[PDB]
Amino acid sequence: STFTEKEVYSSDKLIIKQVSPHTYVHVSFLDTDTFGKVACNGMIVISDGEAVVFDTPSTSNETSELLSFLEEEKLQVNAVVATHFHLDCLGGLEAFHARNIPSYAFKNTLSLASQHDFPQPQKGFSDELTLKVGTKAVFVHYFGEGHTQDNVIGYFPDDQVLFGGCLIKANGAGKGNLEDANVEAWPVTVNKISTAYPNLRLVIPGHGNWGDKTLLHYTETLFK
Ligand SMILES: [Zn+2]
Ligand SMILES: [Zn+2]
């Protein structure tokens, strides 16, 4: 019953893996002070020749590599979503903006990005955003604070896939960077996610290996 994952792009700086019929993980790498060399995940949803991207790679160069691949595949890139204000979500937004691809994020991500002098998403939403992807859609939803105050998820119901971003930890992973975190809210937010999407088959964390609903339960337990 498992989908046979397939690598569809690989370079020194970026890997893209198909993880379900319509969803893909993009992986870029961050050499950071306190935690080592860090893989950062985003998601691409592709259907009917159209694509929506969740998170940019941290750097402009890696984001251009991502967009070059989507262009070689002849895809219309409809939107990019920054799932919170940190650079492993939006460091590469100008590559999207240069191509007239609109960027979206939680309303508070816009103000936080501006206050940090980071690339700014163009369009804010307050609650739940629907983004068309071909004949399907992907949904962006705020369930509360956790990894940051503004973090949002992406939900693609056709394949029962959740992009948890940095609010969701890989199975067995540590708590990671808590500098901007609300650890009181975090388990409450994650339980709201589990309760909303009980049928999930695939959960993609912001860092590390993706998996199934286990990741939601693991993350809630880690912060309980
Ligand atoms: Zn973050
Ligand atoms: Zn992160």
Author numbering: 29 to 46, 48 to 100, 102 to 104, 106 to 107, 109 to 131, 133 to 150, 165 to 172, 1173, ...
Sentences reproduced from the published study:
The structures of MYO-1 and ECV-1 were successfully solved by X-ray crystallography to 2.17 and 1.33 Å, respectively. The structure of ECV-1 was refined to an Rwork and Rfree of 0.16 and 0.19, respectively, with one molecule in the asymmetrical unit. In contrast to the complex H-bond network in NDM-1 involving Ser69, Asp84, Lys121 and Ser262, we found different amino acids in MYO-1 (Cys69, Cys121, Gly262), ECV-1 (Cys69, Cys121, Gly262) and SHD-1 (Ala69, Arg121, Gly262). The lack of Lys121 or Arg121 in MYO-1 and ECV-1 was compensated for by an extensive network of water molecules. In addition, ECV-1 demonstrated high catalytic activity towards meropenem (65% compared with NDM-1), whereas imipenem, penicillins and cephalosporins were hydrolysed to a lower degree (∼10%–40%). ECV-1 and SHD-1 exhibited thermostabilities ∼3 and ∼8°C higher than MYO-1 and NDM-1.
The class B MBLs are enzymes with the ability to hydrolyse virtually all β-lactam antibiotics, including carbapenems. In subclass B1, Zn1 is coordinated by three histidine residues (His/Gly116, His118 and His196), while the Zn2 binding site is coordinated by Asp120, Cys221 and His263.2,4–7 In B2 MBLs, the Zn1 binding site displays one altered residue (Asn116, His118 and His196), whereas the Zn2 site is identical to that of the subclass B1 MBLs.
